Structure 1
């Protein structure tokens, strides 16, 4: 479990008063969902998985 870690978006990290370091690799590329993003993904499902 100590090797299992929780993650947040860069915007959510900033909300948590955290700034991602330069060049940091994405620990998890996952589904992205925001108002404009959600509507765009509903427009076409091919990029719903491709957002990451």
Structure 2
């Protein structure tokens, strides 16, 4: 989050492209033979694309 700001376009800060990182869901970790520890707060919250969420 402390990445240097290259500039401002119409008030919006422009960041470097090589700063994008991804994560995985609990089901994805399960496929990777890993189990999420109980009580852990999820690190990132994003709008999911699952059919159950899509119907909701």
TM-score of the two chains, using structure 2 as the length reference: 0.52
Give the SS at the match of 1:11.
helix
Structure-1 residue corresponding to 2:24 = 8
Structure 2 distance, partners of 1:29, 1:8, is 11
Structure 2 unaligned blocks of 5 or more: 1-19
Relative contact order higher in (CA < 8 Å, ≥ 6 apart): 1
Task: Identify the structure with the greater strand proportion.
Answer: 2
Moved over 2 A (4+): 35-38
Rg: which structure is higher?
A: 2
The count of residues paired between Structure 1 and Structure 2 equals 37
